[PDB]
């Protein structure tokens, strides 16, 4: 004779965020000419894969 | 978020001199025919690099 079984699967989620202010960004741009938004964006993008 | 720091540098100095009298120099030149000034200058130049 024969028999049958079954199994299941399901995924999960993740979430992250970053914060910065206008005056700090303006001061950094005036002094060093750096862009904070791109820095934080790339940092989050890298950190997600690293922790995965 | 991110943080920054600072570091600094600053150099130093050195000084060295040589001395020879006239009486002893003439006596040595008469007796042996050497050159005290050139020998002293060369020794100074060598030792300056050797000490560093």
UniProtKB/TrEMBL annotation, chains A, B:
Full-protein positions shown: 311 to 362 of 568
Superkingdom as given in the UniProt entry: Viruses
Organism: Escherichia phage P1 (Bacteriophage P1)
UniProt-recorded name of the protein: Gp23
């Amino acid at each position: 004779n024969h028999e049958m079984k079954k199994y299941t699967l399901f995924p999960s989620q993740f979430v992250i965020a970053a914060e910065h202010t206008v005056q700090a960004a303006y001061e950094a741009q005036r002094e060093f000419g750096l862009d904070l938004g791109s820095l934080q964006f790339r940092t989050l993008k890298e950190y997600l894969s690293h922790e995965q």
